[PDB]
Design a protein around this ligand. Structure first.
Ligand SMILES: Nc1ncnc2c1ncn2[C@@H]1O[C@H](COP(=O)(O)OP(=O)(O)OP(=O)(O)O)[C@@H](O)[C@H]1O
Ligand SMILES: Nc1ncnc2c1ncn2[C@@H]1O[C@H](COP(=O)(O)OP(=O)(O)O)[C@@H](O)[C@H]1O
Lengths: 41, 470, 40, 578, 127, 385, 312
């Protein structure tokens, strides 16, 4: 039981990290789009 | 009337129109092209320089030289009347049964105003659904929000149709009551296929349940904004009926997973950063605005009861959709894949199910005074039976005591007779009689959770009362 | 029985014809009202 | 007042131009209907206002007006016996003037502007007044409301109105500066109200429940947490706290509850009776109500509104009990708000400043010396409902890091008809040692040792569960069956407390001391008899068992005679036994 | 059983639909009879005036060449220009100053946009 | 456009026992088959192309290997149409857009295939459309969206992916043509989730619109057990509607035999949980019999060889006979163990090998083999008494 | 690298078995290196010199200290040369690509520099198309004698088969040979794990008239038996070996003997006949009734002979 529980927690951490990275990428690209639209039209 | 021709950008589901500051936010517009075809669209952003319009359907024939945009309505509204009973609509109020359109008594905004918390009252009356595992152990109370959790291959549509066909009130059990209290069913289906649409139409028309029902049907290939709009229109009609004509309406929402996916797509199309696991951050508030439109109001005789239906994406209750539906609704009814594969219909599993308002709709003056204790005894006995069934696979039958063998037989009989009722419609008295007949298999005195008077009054009936004609 | 269904069909036909005649009794007034309201 | 026009509309976010001079986090009215919102960003000549209700139907060019003040509450007479939403809007008058729905853009006042009050001055012209002093009193039901000068007002009194009838609007005191002081004033909800000094946790918070008052006490001005498992009787314990605690004023906050649960709490309270006076309990309570479909900003500001009202009533010199129900729903609203602003999440999608907000809310509790020199205290009991009862949730992890006590309410005990259904193995309290001198000086000098002995007996009973699980209890020898039986006696006769009983609903500290003394004495005599060689079944049928068992149901004033009679019978029955 | 009642109800609904659509056809015939009567100049002038009021910054007035001589009085009054166009009859369209926006006041458009509200009232008139 | 849609009431006979029996698909229905690389999607689709009872087969190779198209082109002309008797290639249309072909044509190939299928349906035939991979279509959409610099959703896919998939899958169905005829289109689409993760957005979107779902297992593919269908994860919503056809064309008790087989499989799955904890030798004899019958069903009924000269195709009557034999043997064994006959002796009964090898019997030699095997089943337990 | 060198050293067709034109044309080797270290490069060069195969080889060398972006061009140049040779001069060309992992790293560098939409773990979305443009250049063409055969080599980062690079490569290519760290740690060479491996074109080149009539059935029987042995290996880790039945003991012994005699051969060149003989010797351990996948004719023909007749 403790081993499987630790594995589950590890997998949860990995998935959450990947989600955070995806959110960061999306924020960056949205910032690029907004900046280009508001600066160069 | 007044048209705008300054289109400057068309890409995907969006187009930009210049000099359109007269368009209100959220307004509904019509888009016409060179060929004369008209498409629908909704305004999603208005500025001094241009307005952004999210176009329904597809943008195949559009061009920047000949397209024109005209206003339809400042705020999305629906025309309602008591003549809507017996009619079918496409999800944005357009009739699809071939009958002439209705003449509205009034036009109401599809988005609803929140109910005042001081105007509500406590739910205190039940609804007979005709299914024993719901009426006895997970009783549905007027004004409750009781969702159904199902899987990918489970027959949730059949259960929805059966409940819509069999649901009724029991005024005679509530003292004398009034023999005439209107009842209606509002059915909303989101993202269904042609096969499911045909099945629902056939089921509603073959038994006369259409005459008291209003159907909002939205197909899988229809635009997603219509899928967003469908439950709100259904609930608008339900609220109008219930709180202006004292109807007892029952609302069934066929698949909320489709609604959540459509909401996610709409949010992504408007460039919004997603929240947990890709779903919108405001998903909880949106689901709350949908679910919280049911209940009973002080000083009114009508009521609204909701039964959302949703398929768990991977049979996982940790998923955002079931988890957030749990926070807002009172209990759940969960289907079992094992029961379905064993040939039992409806495959409702009593152990993971729960109704949080059950204790207020049962007792004396409603159903019967033995209801709660019988339900508790059935629950405990079934749990013991399944545990003994798991143990006997290893330790064998002969090593068990007599009580354990009796419990195992009780569990088998319970699965065969109480759950597996088929398409049969059972009144609450029939279900209670079957429950007592099953409990009679266990010896008297093993029934800890039932008072002695009830046992004396009801214990001792044989299973042949139902086995003769199950 | 089929006789009862035939009776229901005949009753529906007769009532539809009566309703059609009743509507014909006020078609001019309805047209005049619609023309009056539609015009500025 | 800064006045501008709408420039862009996109969802609840509205960009207004011409708003130079508007201040951050000020309340603004958007559109012709006057929808309220908050300024969240200033840029050049523009302002970013985010609206509470929906913005469908608005048009570019509609006026936007700024009030110039942040979110604030009105503090004054007329708050008791009232029901409010998350931003202090009286729901009853909204119902009167609107119907069963809450339409957008409704305007009502938190304090009624028409009710007359019996003014009674306490100052004379020429007096010098400092923030926090008492200007006059007004009777509010069974209370005497003290009209306090706002914390930031100083000057000399010029004129005082004579005693009579006035609304909350007539200036009863005018200063030499020309400042006019009314019966009420406003205060921002996100700024704590000033005090002179915060005292130490020296006195207890008597809840009336034996298990909570004895095993896991909470100091007056402390904090506690409680889970919300279904079927565990949480609402009964909460309303028992409201009825029987030594608090003078109760503030109940529901931030995101279900509709029917809010209906239950709004219907039940107008039926409870205040034991001290016999009148309705609602006459000394304030209810803040929020369902799930109400605007997110109200659900986020509900707890701050409640704690500000509690701080005001503390400043008047009372003791206030604040109950916040389902702070998890508040955290959910905070997460949604943070998502709408596009902030990088931390842990399970919550904003990184969740712990800071929870600490800011919980740290306003404490016993203080008010600016007027009096004493007042605020106690906070916040309910936490994890997604599936998991204690690893960031909300629960951050909550348990700052609260002083944690009463783990359990559903398994409730299944076994043990009420209150509080698990004594998972609960803890950090106030016992600090409160020890008060116990030694106020109930008995031996009480802490007796409590430790009771806890030791419970722990020893819990230690034998493995053997009882593996082997039937009847196989155990005498020295272990005795401790099992005395633990069962403790559970049945001291821990349990029926809240629906006429005299068992409330229990004093000295009654608990007497019951514990009786149980300990019986255990000691039984141990001596066992060492002398008597059979345990002989002990199990002594007449003293019923005397101990019926100690719960005796009256409070009648208790000492019963206690001494049973103590005498403790020696009388055992000496007859060999 | 109730099946015959269903037939009666659907026959009634179909008869009512036929009634309303025949009313609509008679109304459209009456409306299209207007241009052949001397009553059309006043209504078209009023519609053009309303359309010009709808666009405060209107620049040009556009209609079929039959109605331009009648609209010359408003063109000189309101100062707008006039140019012919084979657009829909029984109405006058205007073009805004920017050339992007455009209003239309065709009588059939008014009928289409008012029949939704008028149907409920004329249901009482018929029966 | 069509005149009217119709309810499905006629099976699409794929020729594979497991798909035709446990998870049937109707004539106008839709099915999906996901799995990781190496599971056996392409072999299954080619088998459906070879052995199904459709009039016309349209094969779309969207974004896959060119050697597969070469194999089809070289082999199909030499095969025989099951019903017409002419060359198999004379009823087939191929659309090929291989991996190294231009990306933007992947989206076009699917539409071209479905339009040709709809045209042949309008002529009045029953058409089967095989889409080799919709994941390649999704990836092409993602690449184009990246070029457009759009806001992605989930794993970078454009927001309208689900709408596109629903629009594609809703073109199937049995209809009444505008000319008054009757035709049908059946769509079977393979899915290639990245890493075999079934939580991927394309697979989840496909779950919500198909009528049948055939999941493949990598664990079964590793041990060379084909068609490698995950029985626990697959389902079919057409089972109830096709019952009258089975009763009229296969046997009056066929649904009951299918239900019995499903119940045995579910019981075996339930017992395997205990088996994984304590081992088979800890169970009672009835449980051991259930386990052995489940293993026999897995190895002698669900298993089918796509390259064997006789096992490649299987009729409905052959599957019915095999199921009847298995059920009869199970009944006899249960009766024998109820009276104390040891299970460890039953497993060496000589008729077990005959039951196991009944698969390879020819389609026309089969009925005599079935009669002999049934009588031998009766004798093997009657001779014990 | 050792396995690739051994395959290049020992590869040969068997015209006598298939009855084709008996010819002894040697393979031409095209060797493309991407981010190779000095140790591996020296090993490869010394091996080729020892076998004398450099005179038939074209080498494109991109060492680890060379610029990263050059790796975009190396596979394309190598495949251009290979295609030219094979389809214009009737050569049979064998192509070895050292590490597609470094190629994917360079691709990700360029993609991140250009602000592309990533796939999984940051790799660009067009990586599938880019890899397909390289792998799909092999094959045979009708009307021509030449051929191109590819043996790409790649390192799974954490032995994770679900990493994007191995995943896409498996989705594009026509099989894979997967190595096992568990087999390597036991001293078995080559450490090829048969269960995760796959050859999609196996049925085309085996059977009667190509290698032998019993090839496919023997392969299937070996696969099933090895899977059963591995499952029993899992079981004995829980219930202990003494609790086994005799059948499970037989399968366990078969699995051990398989891993120690069939997989483990070292640096020796086995003909197909020798391999089939060893496989039949291993299959003879099981009872004759356990070989369900093999027809009775082949069992009668080949079953029975023992392993000691080969070694010992
Ligand atoms: N302290 C108590 N004294 C007496 N009876 C109690 C006490 N606590 C609980 N009970 C009884 O047990 C029941 C607890 O179950 P119930 O679900 O009704 O609780 P609840 O107070 O509504 O709280 P929750 O919302 O956690 O379920 C109460 O309704 C009451 O009958
Ligand atoms: N029914 C079957 N009979 C025999 N072999 C099969 C069967 N199904 C799959 N295979 C084998 O599995 C391999 C995987 O190939 P394929 O079917 O193309 O898988 P996918 O397209 O899922 O990757 C094929 O080479 C074939 O060897």
């Amino acid at each position: 039981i403790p081993g499987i529980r630790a594995q589950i927690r590890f997998i949860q951490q990995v998935l959450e990290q990947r989600e955070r990275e995806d959110t960061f990428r999306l924020k960056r690209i949205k910032g690029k789009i907004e900046a280009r639209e508001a600066e160069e039209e | 009337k007044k048209e705008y021709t300054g289109i400057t950008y068309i890409s995907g589901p969006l187009l930009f129109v210049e000099n359109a500051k007269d368009l209100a936010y959220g307004a509904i517009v019509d888009i016409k092209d060179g060929t004369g075809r008209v498409r629908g669209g909704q305004v999603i952003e208005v500025s001094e320089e241009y307005a952004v319009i999210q176009v329904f359907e597809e943008t195949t024939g559009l061009d920047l030289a000949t397209t024109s945009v005209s206003l339809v309505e400042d705020v999305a509204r629906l025309g309602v009347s008591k003549e809507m009973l017996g009619r079918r609509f496409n999800g944005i109020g357009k009739p699809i049964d071939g009958l002439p359109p209705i003449t509205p008594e009034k036009r109401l905004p599809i988005t609803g105003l929140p109910l005042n918390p001081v105007a509500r009252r406590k739910p205190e009356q039940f609804i007979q659904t005709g299914i024993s595992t719901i009426d006895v152990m997970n009783t549905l109370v007027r004004g409750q929000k009781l969702p159904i959790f199902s899987g990918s291959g489970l027959p949730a549509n059949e259960i929805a149709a059966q409940i819509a066909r069999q649901a009724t009130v029991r005024p005679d059990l509530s003292g004398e009551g009034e023999k005439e209290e209107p009842f209606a069913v509002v059915f909303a289906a989101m993202g269904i296929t042609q096969r499911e649409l045909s099945y629902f139409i056939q089921e509603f028309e073959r038994t006369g349940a259409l005459s008291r029902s209003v159907l909002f049907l939205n197909k899988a290939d229809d635009p997603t904004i219509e899928r967003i709009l469908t439950p709100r229109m259904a609930l608008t009609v339900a609220e109008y009926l219930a709180f202006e004509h004292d109807y007892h309406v029952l609302v069934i929402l066929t698949d909320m997973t489709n609604y959540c996916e459509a909401l996610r797509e709409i949010g992504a199309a408007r460039e919004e950063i997603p929240g947990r696991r890709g779903y919108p951050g405001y998903m909880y508030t949106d689901l709350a605005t949908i679910y919280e439109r049911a209940g009973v109001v002080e000083g009114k005789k009508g009521s609204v009861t909701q039964i959302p239906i949703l398929s768990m994406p991977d049979d996982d209750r940790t998923h955002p959709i079931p988890d957030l539906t749990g926070y807002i609704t009172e209990g759940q009814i969960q289907l079992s894949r094992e029961l379905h594969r064993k040939g039992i219909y409806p495959p409702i599993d009593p152990l993971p199910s729960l109704s949080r308002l059950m204790n207020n709709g049962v007792g004396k003056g409603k159903t019967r005074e033995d209801h709660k204790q019988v339900s508790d005894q059935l629950y405990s006995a079934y749990a013991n039976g399944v545990d003994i069934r798991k143990l006997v696979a290893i330790i064998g039958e002969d090593a068990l005591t007599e009580n354990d063998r009796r419990y195992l037989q009780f569990a088998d009989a319970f699965e065969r007779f109480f759950i597996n009722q088929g398409q049969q419609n059972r009144s609450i008295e029939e279900s209670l009689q079957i429950a007592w007949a099953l409990l009679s298999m266990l010896p008297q005195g093993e029934l800890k959770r039932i008072s002695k008077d009830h046992i004396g009054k009801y214990y001792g009936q044989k299973l042949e009362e139902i086995w003769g004609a199950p | 029985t089929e006789a009862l269904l035939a009776r229901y069909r005949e009753r529906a036909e007769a009532e539809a014809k009566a309703v059609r005649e009743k509507a014909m009794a006020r078609l001019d007034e309805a047209v005049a009202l619609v023309l009056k309201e539609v015009l500025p | 007042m800064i006045q501008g026009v709408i420039q862009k509309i996109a969802g609840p976010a509205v960009i207004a131009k011409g708003m130079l001079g508007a201040r951050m986090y000020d309340i603004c009215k958007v559109g012709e209907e006057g929808l309220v919102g908050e300024i969240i960003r200033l840029d050049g000549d523009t302002a970013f206002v985010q609206v509470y209700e929906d913005t469908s139907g608005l048009k570019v060019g509609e006026p936007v007006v700024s009030t110039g003040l942040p979110l604030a509450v009105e503090l004054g007479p007329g708050m008791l016996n009232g029901i409010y939403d998350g931003i202090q809007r009286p729901l009853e008058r909204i119902r009167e003037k609107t119907g069963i729905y809450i339409t957008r853009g409704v305007v009502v006042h938190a304090l009624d502007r028409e009710k007359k009050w019996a003014w009674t001055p306490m100052v004379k012209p020429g007096d010098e007044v400092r923030g926090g002093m008492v200007l006059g009193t007004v009777p509010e039901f069974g209370f005497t409301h003290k009209i306090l000068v706002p914390p930031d007002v100083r000057g000399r009194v010029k004129e005082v109105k004579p005693a009579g009838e006035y609304t909350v609007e007539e200036p009863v005191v005018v200063l030499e500066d020309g400042t006019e002081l009314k019966m009420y004033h406003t205060w921002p909800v996100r700024r704590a109200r000033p005090v002179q000094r915060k005292l130490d946790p020296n006195t207890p918070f008597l809840t009336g429940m034996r298990i909570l008052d004895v095993l896991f006490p909470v100091a007056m001005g402390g904090t506690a947490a409680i889970p919300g498992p279904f079927g565990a009787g949480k609402s009964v314990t909460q309303q028992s706290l409201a009825k029987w605690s030594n608090a003078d004023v109760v503030v109940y906050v529901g931030c995101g509850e279900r509709g029917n649960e809010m209906t239950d709490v709004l219907v039940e309270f107008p039926e409870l009776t205040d034991p001290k006076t016999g009148g309705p309990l609602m006459h000394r309570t304030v209810l803040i109500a929020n369902t799930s479909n109400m605007p997110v900003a109200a659900r986020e500001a509900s707890i701050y509104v409640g704690v500000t009202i509690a701080e005001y009533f503390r400043d008047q010199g009372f003791s206030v009990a604040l109950m916040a129900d389902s702070t998890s729903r508040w955290a959910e609203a905070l997460r949604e708000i943070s998502s709408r602003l596009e902030e990088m999440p931390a842990e399970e999608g919550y904003p990184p400043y969740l712990a800071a907000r929870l600490a800011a809310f919980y740290e306003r509790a404490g016993k203080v010396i008010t600016l007027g020199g009096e004493e007042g205290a605020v106690t906070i009991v916040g309910a936490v409902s994890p997604p599936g009862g998991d204690m690893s949730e960031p909300v629960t992890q951050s909550t348990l890091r700052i609260v002083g006590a944690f009463w783990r309410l359990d559903a398994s005990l409730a299944f076994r008809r043990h009420f209150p259904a509080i698990n004594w193995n998972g609960s803890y309290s950090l106030f016992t040692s600090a409160l020890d001198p008060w116990y030694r000086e106020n109930v008995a000098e031996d009480y802490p040792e007796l409590r430790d002995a009771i806890s030791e007996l419970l722990q020893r009973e819990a230690g034998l569960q493995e053997i009882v699980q593996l082997v039937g209890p009847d196989a155990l020898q005498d020295a272990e069956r005795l401790v099992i039986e005395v633990g069962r006696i403790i559970r049945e006769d001291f821990l349990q407390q029926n809240a629906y009983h006429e005299v068992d609903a409330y229990c004093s500290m000295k009654k608990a001391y007497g019951i514990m003394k009786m149980i300990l004495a019986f255990y000691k005599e039984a141990e001596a008899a066992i060492k002398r060689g008597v059979s345990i079944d002989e002990i199990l049928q002594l007449p003293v068992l019923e005397r101990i068992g019926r100690a719960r149901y005796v009256s409070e004033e009648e208790f000492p005679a019963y206690f001494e009679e049973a103590m005498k019978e403790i020696q009388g029955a055992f000496k007859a036994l060999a | 059983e109730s099946a015959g009642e269903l037939l009666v109800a659907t026959a009634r609904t179909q008869a009512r639909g036929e009634v309303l659509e025949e009313v609509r056809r008679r109304v459209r015939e009456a409306l299209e009879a207007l241009p052949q009567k001397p009553e059309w100049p006043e209504v078209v002038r009023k519609l053009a005036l309303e359309a010009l009021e709808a666009l405060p910054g209107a620049k040009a007035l556009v209609a079929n060449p039959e109605d331009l001589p009648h609209l010359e009085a408003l063109a000189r009054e309101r100062g707008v220009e006039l140019q012919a166009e084979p657009a829909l009859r029984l109405g006058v369209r205007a073009v805004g100053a920017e050339g992007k926006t455009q209003v239309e006041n065709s009588l059939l458009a008014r009928l289409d946009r008012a029949w939704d509200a008028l149907s409920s009232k004329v249901a009482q008139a018929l029966w």
